[PDB]
Structure 1
Amino acid sequence: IDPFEMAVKQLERAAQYMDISEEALEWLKKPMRIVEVSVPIEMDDGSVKVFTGFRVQHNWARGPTKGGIRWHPAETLSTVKALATWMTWKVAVVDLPYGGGKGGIIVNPKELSEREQERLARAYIRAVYDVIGPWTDIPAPDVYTNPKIMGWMMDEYETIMRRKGPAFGVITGKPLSIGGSLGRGTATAQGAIFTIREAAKALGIDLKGKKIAVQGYGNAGYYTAKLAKEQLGMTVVAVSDSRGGIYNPDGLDPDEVLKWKREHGSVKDFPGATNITNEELLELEVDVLAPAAIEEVITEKNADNIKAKIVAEVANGPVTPEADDILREKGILQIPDFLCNAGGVTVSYFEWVQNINGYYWTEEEVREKLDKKMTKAFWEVYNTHKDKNIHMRDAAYVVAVSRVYQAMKDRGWVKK
């Protein structure tokens, strides 16, 4: 099972639901540019090691491509291509003037020192400089990359560019000291919370006082639970990590659970709470369930047991298509993954706008703009869901691919 083949299959199953020409589909099934480079760095012991780096630009009909950089030992070209393809639809569904992009280096950064990490970031920029830029390709943080590496990459790009333009805007997720944007740390969770609120409004539910269960307690899951409790007024009854789950009918305080996890490395054995595991955690009687962890967690094995009225897929592809079916005929509103967690890329777009313009916004302005963007995206996807009587993930694919196809036709790339 190849990641890129899965992405192409999903695109074809989507195209089954819309009027798109075969030449446009063939165009969309292939990345428009793939760059594979050697990334040589000098190790701390004095030797030179060469790493493999990627930069895939799937499509740029709608504007400059956008996508993060992953530093993973299991990184492959096919994974980067699939993620760039998904980034295209992610920026299209939330209506950004972006295409799809993705980069990566096959490296285990946990065994690299800080100096070696900086050398790796600078060497990656020196290798891929010719295909990136503020108006060509804007990288961002991803798995095992963080704002510190983003700042190193921006500095190297500015050094090569000789400060002839907005070098701050070449890469997003930067520290606030150098062109960073406010509200970027809790972007994904804020977008997920906005989508959950709109979904509840669509379903006729006032979320104040009902239960939410969150799986995965990284930055996405923890902030999802926290913002749910404050903004949506819901009760957080269950959380879990890479070890096990903790459940409390009376409600868990996300700050205390985060303190527990930091102190002991796991959320397990939290005071006044029943210790459980992920598999039985997935089926608590809650109004909202937010899987925010590893992929492929809801499957036909346990899809029928799911009892959440709203499922918000913060993670990337937590739900299999079959589970999508059973969840649909069960009567449950699923927020598609690349619509639910599109808040991060939206706030990255806001950061890029601030960098390009040279004028920086406040927390309130970023928050309000993100609210409007995410509300509009959710409502367009839901209206397509109603009108075409398709699954809501298929509606998200219809919206995104329709936008990209229109942009491609407008440029004259495809004549039909």
Structure 2
Amino acid sequence: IDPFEMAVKQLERAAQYMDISEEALEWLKKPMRIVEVSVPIEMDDGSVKVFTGFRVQHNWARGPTKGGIRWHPAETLSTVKALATWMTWKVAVVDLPYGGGKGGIIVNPKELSEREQERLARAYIRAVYDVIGPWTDIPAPDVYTNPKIMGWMMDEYETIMRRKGPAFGVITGKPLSIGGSLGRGTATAQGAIFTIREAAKALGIDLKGKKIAVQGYGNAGYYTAKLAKEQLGMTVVAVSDSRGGIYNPDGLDPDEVLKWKREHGSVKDFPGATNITNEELLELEVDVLAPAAIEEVITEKNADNIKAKIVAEVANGPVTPEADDILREKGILQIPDFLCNAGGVTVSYFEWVQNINGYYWTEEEVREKLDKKMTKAFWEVYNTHKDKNIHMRDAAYVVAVSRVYQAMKDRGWVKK
């Protein structure tokens, strides 16, 4: 099934639970500007190859649009549009002065050399310069793009811009040497930890000494486990990568597990732990569960088997709506996916603020501001959850769409 249709259906289901005019819904069902450009680069053999680049700006009622750039061979305009629509609600739920945006290039970056990658980044900037800017559209790292590409892109934008303004703020996720921000490596995990702490506070659970299980041991999963163990004082009992999983009731040390992963290539056969698979790992009796891996892991097949009191969807939509209803029926508190992992876009917003102001913060200041933003967003969503007696995901959609609708009404875009 197409992704943009999925996003529009999600938006309509959200609008079912809130009072929104028909014209506003029709406005929100369409991206406000879609730009498709040709991105020509000259390769190492001397030939010129043309790639397809996208830049979708779904809505900018609340402010300049925000969103990353994907370099995937399976990129489509539908995927970019759906992700921009998703980014609108993501920045709206955590109360940022941002709209929704998304870019992408249909390219296999594995077959490109470093020089070709730099040429691709610079050519993409030259192609989409007319629709981006510090106050118009702020790109960011995404799938198969990294801070190196972000720095190349910022340099090209500054060259075109003739240094007439804050060219550092045109793009986020930059290296620290050029307008980069601290806390940019643990943003998602720190936001997830703050949301988990707030959820435990709401449920009355003290996390000191409790159990956590994490699926997926990449950046997000590893940092989530590490920050949970240190800040929340919890007992990490199960971690897993795409290969396999391990279990130890007394507690695992995430640093040692990461070292083992680096050495042997996987978390398999970790000393002192029992090797398990992802599916049973999802069903251990643990206080909180943090799926930080491939989407759609909790379905109707295993939804009733979840024994976790809190499920923090660190990954992008790892739970299906049927599993959502089943989990809610069990009383299991769910943190919606675009609320749990909203720390990354919040820290990107902080980086943009630092670049715009010309003044840069420390790690402690970024951490405290992230704490404030995530706590306030979670409490807003939870209060909507209780007041409307609807699902947590539905409450997050209600909050985001209500904010965007209010901004649209204030500008006079929609009269009703």
Report the TM-score, using the length of structure 2 for normalisation.
0.99
Deviation at 1:144, TM superposition (A): 0.8
Say which is worse superposed, 164-173 or 42-51, in terms of deviation: 42-51
Deviations 1:237-290 (A, max 9, x none): 111111111111111111111111122221111111111111111111100100
- Using the TM superposition, give the Cα deviation of residue 412 of structure 1 relative to its aligned residue in structure 2, in angstroms: 0.5
Q: What is the distance in 1 between the residues matched to 2:6 and 2:120?
A: 31
Summarize deviations over 1:10-61 as a string: whole Å, max 9, x none: 1000000000001000100110011111111111111111111111100000
1:302-346 Cα distance to aligned partner (Å, 9 max, x none): 100011000000011100111110000101000000000000000
* Secondary structure in structure 2 of the residue aligned to 1:13: helix
State how far apart, in whole Å, the 2-side matches of 1:248 and 1:80 are: 41
> Secondary structure of the equivalent of 1:299?
coil
For the aligned residue pairs, the C-alpha RMSD in angstroms reads: 0.7
Q: 1:45 aligns to what SS in structure 2?
A: coil
d(CA) in 1 for partners of 2:53 and 2:282? 37
Per the TM alignment, residue 357 of structure 1 is displaced from its structure 2 partner at its CA by 0.4
Determine the structure 1 residue equivalent to 2:53.
53
TM-score, normalized by length of structure 1?
A: 0.99
> 2:251 matched to 1:251?
yes
**Distance in 2 of aligned mates of 1:246 and 1:53:** 41
Runs of 5+ consecutive residues of structure 2 not aligned to the other structure? none
CA distance in structure 1 between the aligned counterparts of 2:90 and 2:291, rounded to whole angstroms: 18
Q: Residues of 1 paired with 2:263 and 2:26: CA distance?
A: 51
Separation in structure 2 between the aligned mates of residue 307 and residue 275 of structure 1, nearest angstrom: 20
1:31 is paired with a residue of what secondary structure? Answer: coil
Q: Name whichever of 215-224 and 104-113 sits farther off.
A: 104-113
Partner of 1:169: 169
Task: Name the counterpart of 2:305.
Answer: 305
Q: Which residue of 1 aligns with 2:117?
A: 117
* CA offset digits 1:57-86 (Å, max 9, x no partner): 000000000000111111111111111001
Deviation digits for residues 202-238 of structure 1 (CA, Å, limit 9, x no counterpart)? 0001101011000011100000000000000111111
Partner SS state of residue 90, structure 1? helix
For 1:256 and 1:42, locate their aligned partners in 2 and report how far apart those are by CA, in whole Å: 45
Point out 4+ residue stretches in structure 1 off by more than 6 angstroms. Answer: none
Instruction: Return the alpha-carbon distance in structure 1 between the equivalents of residues 140 and 407 of structure 2.
Output: 24
Give CA deviations for 1:373-400 in whole Å, capped at 9, x if unaligned.
0000000000000000000100000000
Match of 1:105 in 2: 105
1:101-132, Cα deviation, whole Å (9 max, x unpaired) = 00011111112111111111111101111000
Correspondence for 1:88: 88
Q: How many Å separate the matches in 1 of 2:46 and 2:277? A: 46
Give the match's secondary structure for 1:83: helix
Q: For residue 81 of structure 1, give the secondary structure of its aligned residue in structure 2.
A: helix
- Mapped to 2, the partners of 1:260 and 1:33 lie a distance apart of 47
Could you tell which deviates more after superposition, 383-392 or 244-253?
Answer: 244-253
Q: State how far apart, in whole Å, the 1-side matches of 2:394 and 2:414 are.
A: 23
Equivalent residue of 2:261, what SS? helix
Instruction: Give the equivalent residue in structure 2 for 1:68.
Output: 68
Query: In structure 2, what is the Cα distance between the partners aligned to 1:30 and 1:301?
Result: 35
Distance 1:55 1:247 in 2: 44
| 2: CA distance, partners of 1:272 / 1:82 | 44
Partner of 1:276: 276
Q: Secondary structure at the match of 2:304?
A: coil
Partners in 2 of 1:186 and 1:322 — Cα distance? 31
Hey, what's the Cα distance between the residues in 2 that align with 1:394 and 1:68?
A: 25
CA distance in 2, matches of 1:270, 1:116: 40
Deviation at 1:3, TM superposition (A): 0.8
Matched residue pairs, number?
A: 416
CA distance in 2, matches of 1:202, 1:257: 31
Gaps of 5+ in 1: none
Aligned to 1:304, the other structure's residue is in SS state: helix
Measure, in 2, the Cα distance between the counterparts of 1:45 and 1:284.
54
- Map residues 320-339 of structure 1 onto 2, 5 A cutoff: 320-339=320-339
Take 1:265 and 1:104, find their aligned partners in 2: how far apart are those partners? Answer: 30
The residue number in structure 1 matching 2:146 is: 146
